[PDB]
Amino acid sequence: NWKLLAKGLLIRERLKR
């Protein structure tokens, strides 16, 4: 899915913990 890979590449700054 391009929605699941859009959160996966929404990574642009960082992630967290």
Next chain:
Amino acid sequence: TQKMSEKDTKEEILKAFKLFDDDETGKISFKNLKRVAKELGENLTDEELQEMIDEADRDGDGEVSEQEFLRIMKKTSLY
């Protein structure tokens, strides 16, 4: 009238579409999706992500625009 700015969330999701373009050109292939999403790890396989490039470039031109990482991230179609 104060002045409402449109720039912070627009430069966040378009800045990530700039992570797609390694040589800086504005349109991409299969490996750019996987590559910068590869830095994280990614839940999907390369077979599921090849089905995605065939879905959105239906006609088969070559490379995708700002509207695919931006336009699939924004609009969620309900079932």
